[PDB]
Design a protein around this ligand. Structure first.
Ligand SMILES: [Mg+2]
Lengths: 105, 230, 195, 49, 69, 231
């Protein structure tokens, strides 16, 4: 159970942030989710302080992070960091990352 | 028929070289078409001035060492890449640097010529040590469009040049960084409309607003030939 | 299916959803409600034979609230033999099982909109209306005999605006083809009150 | 399958190069495309919500 | 939206009576007996009270002194 | 000191298929203009299409006529594909009346001045009975994009006649757009490119008008950019 700030969207499906799926053990194959509204003011304050997603990044079981990137993210990053022996722009010297982006894009 | 034209063009210019620009609301799908067109035009085709070649009085190859500069030659080339100069009338001009004594040789120490203005007088170039501190060089700056790497000129160097002719990468375009995000924005019933936030960092010379101005201007002059419904 | 196994025709024929010819002949009349076939003289019974008529079934409610409609395949004057498939049942074409539809896919991650097993789809599919299904709900109004008196089905319904009656006939039943919405009065009934 | 693809004048490896329709730059490393027979199952969102 | 309350819990380390003082303040704010000491940016009164707590203007003792005054 | 693109020869291979060329394009603007045009064309081209139909003997989309083999719903599906060119008015009422055995094609529509039936052989229905007769009145509107029935249902505006049959409107004539930038040897220049945009349409919009309107829209948005208030 976690609290989120809603953003109005079209459609009849709830949109769930990807990083938290691991925490929910949620899968997009017809799994459904329930949504409750805290009524009194103390409940609202409790939700925003104690239960909000950003406040729960470490698992209560062990200390390690729960929101680690799962599958697509890690694949993209892996592709990004691996190097190749020979390519375009071998061995030129750049003054910083900004022109690196200039060159790649 | 009747389209939806953008209003409320807000621009938050923190740190004059860094400008965030917000644009809403935009018809469906035009976010990416327009963002990408602008980005490519800004990045690839922009008239500017930049350092092209350099002659060192002391070293014949880029890996040799000059006595009394702790920084290697490559560091000097990298410092010269950052030089943002604006010349007014002449097309190609040759600046001379001659410095002695202890301390940081900065852009200000260049000989003050007529048409050329160095926007950043405090940009470090070299560090000179004690009692010898002899630095002399001739840097040629030219006008051009876009980005020109060293490799493409050095390829076509069958025209043999005297030793010391050190080629430098030409950074003509004044934009150092450009990016655009597109995000959802709804007019009270239609949700599939989008806002374009363009974050741009330039290299001092021109302020971002006017950069955008001439970018949009350029694309419009090319398009001008067909557009006639007015 | 572009890629099948060949069993589709066996399944379609053997299920009772198709209309299959019992005595081969020639199709005399084709309509979108019935197919009338003139039997061939060879197989034609001598005494009191006549011709064969196949009445088709149009949109009715299945157990799952789906539509059960049969379409004719053949045209006027085509010869038919015993055991061929005249009319296609639900989700079958020309005798073959066609459960769904075959579309052009590309295997790639597209800005994490297909992050997990989720699927991205192009607007052309909805524009061309190829995944639109018809469903069918059944509703029942029962007028019993109470001991205070039988209830009535009349169209005279207390303190309802004439807007609600507009779509009702004089007998109190909606007109076939009328467009209704949630909360609209399907049929008018009054419970009698006594004492 | 390879033979049938060749007879149609398509890449024998069954993958083609695709251009991103939104931005226009080419994708590195060509991708697998082709027609697959899909079904819409009875789990329809309007009943679940 | 105020995505983290870490500084408010650093003000009162119990992390529970934080919720109580913030609820009392936000309840004095909603039923309009009091006024916010911070310029609101279209926040609701809960996040306003947390924003006030993190800036050090309000705690339990300030509530008690102001109430008796 | 620049170049500028001039619209050159526009080859027409078929009534639907067309090639449009732009010769003097500066380096780098090839892809920019190609993609911008592709987007505008595919997204924003205005066209006309049938919005709703009334046939006489039919209460609702799901019933059936005597002497026809298609269901009424399939008849609407056939009408959705009807390619028509309207010149002056915004809403036209076409009339189709046919009797006897035969395929009712699009050619049988009552010939009005302002309406052009692009593909007269396009089939609509098949009659199967000597005395079977079909009469119908098709209402055609102008619009952009894709509008379904169900959204317009909010604005019903006295849909009271049960004979009305609403059809989803695909207000868009262009089916496909591709472009190629290839080396444009200009007699006095080294590296120039020419853009060839080949477009496939249903044969209503002429290429020149499409390209002109697309360039117009893009130029308009750029105009919006030229001024910057900063106020
Ligand atoms: Mg699941």
């Amino acid at each position: 159970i976690q609290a989120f700030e809603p953003v109005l969207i079209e459609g009849k499906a709830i949109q769930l942030h990807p990083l938290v799926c691991a925490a929910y053990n949620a899968d997009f194959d017809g799994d459904q989710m329930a949504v409750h509204v805290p009524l009194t003011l103390e409940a609202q304050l409790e939700a925003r302080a104690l239960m909000m997603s950003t406040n729960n990044i470490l698992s209560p079981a062990n200390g390690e992070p729960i929101i680690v990137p799962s599958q697509d993210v890690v694949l993209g990053l892996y592709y990004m960091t691996r190097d190749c022996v020979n390519a375009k722009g071998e061995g030129m010297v750049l003054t910083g990352p900004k022109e690196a982006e200039r060159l790649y894009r | 028929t009747e389209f939806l034209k953008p209003r409320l063009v807000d621009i938050e210019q923190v740190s004059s070289t860094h400008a965030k620009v917000t644009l809403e609301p935009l018809e469906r799908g035009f976010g990416h078409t327009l963002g990408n067109a602008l980005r490519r035009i800004l990045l690839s085709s922009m008239p500017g001035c930049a350092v092209t070649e350099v002659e060192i009085d002391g070293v014949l190859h880029e890996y040799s060492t000059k006595e009394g500069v702790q920084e290697d030659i490559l560091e000097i080339l990298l410092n010269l890449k950052g030089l943002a100069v604006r010349v007014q009338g002449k097309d190609e001009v040759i600046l001379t640097l001659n410095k002695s004594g202890i301390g940081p040789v900065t852009a200000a120490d260049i000989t003050h010529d007529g048409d050329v203005e160095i926007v950043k007088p405090q940009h470090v170039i070299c560090h000179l040590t004690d009692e010898n501190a002899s630095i002399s060089m001739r840097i040629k700056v030219q006008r051009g469009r876009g980005y020109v790497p060293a490799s493409t000129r050095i390829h076509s160097e069958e025209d043999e040049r005297p030793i010391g002719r050190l080629l430098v990468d030409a950074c003509y375009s004044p934009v150092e960084r450009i990016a655009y995000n597109v995000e959802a924005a709804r007019v009270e019933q239609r949700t599939d409309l989008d806002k374009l936030v363009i974050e741009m960092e330039t290299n001092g010379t021109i302020d971002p607003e006017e950069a955008i101005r001439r970018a949009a201007t350029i694309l419009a002059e090319q398009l001008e030939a067909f557009v006639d419904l007015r | 299916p572009l890629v099948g196994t060949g069993m589709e025709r066996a399944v379609a024929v053997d299920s009772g959803v198709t209309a299959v010819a019992k005595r081969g002949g020639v199709v005399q009349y084709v309509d979108a409600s019935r197919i009338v076939i003139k039997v061939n003289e060879d197989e034609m019974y001598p005494g009191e034979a006549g011709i064969d008529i196949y009445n088709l079934t149009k949109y009715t409610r299945s157990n799952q609230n789906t539509c059960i409609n049969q379409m004719p395949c053949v045209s006027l004057g085509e010869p038919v033999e015993r055991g061929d498939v005249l009319a296609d049942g639900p989700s079958t074409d020309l005798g073959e099982l066609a459960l769904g539809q075959n579309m052009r896919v590309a295997f790639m991650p597209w800005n994490g909109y297909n992050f997990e097993d989720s699927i991205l789809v192009s607007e052309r599919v909805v524009q061309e209306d190829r995944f639109t299904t018809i469903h069918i709900q059944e509703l029942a109004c029962v007028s019993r005999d109470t001991k205070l008196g039988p209830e009535e089905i009349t169209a005279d319904i207390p303190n309802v605006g004439e807007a609600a009656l507009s779509k009702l006939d004089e007998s109190g039943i909606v007109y076939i083809g009328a467009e209704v919405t949630g909360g609209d009065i399907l049929v008018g009934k009054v419970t009698p009150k006594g004492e | 399958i390879k033979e049938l693809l060749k007879l149609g004048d398509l890449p024998t490896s069954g993958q083609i190069r695709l251009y991103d329709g939104r931005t226009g730059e080419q994708f590195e490393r060509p991708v697998t495309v082709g027609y697959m027979y899909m079904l819409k199952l009875n789990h329809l969102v309007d009943d679940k919500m | 939206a105020r995505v983290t309350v870490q500084d408010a819990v650093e003000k009162i380390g119990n992390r529970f009576d934080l919720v109580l003082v913030a609820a009392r303040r936000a309840r004095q704010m909603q039923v309009g007996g009091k006024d916010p000491l911070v310029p609101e940016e279209n926040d609701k009164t809960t996040v306003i009270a947390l924003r006030e707590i993190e800036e050090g203007l309000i705690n339990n003792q300030i509530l008690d002194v102001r109430e008796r005054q």
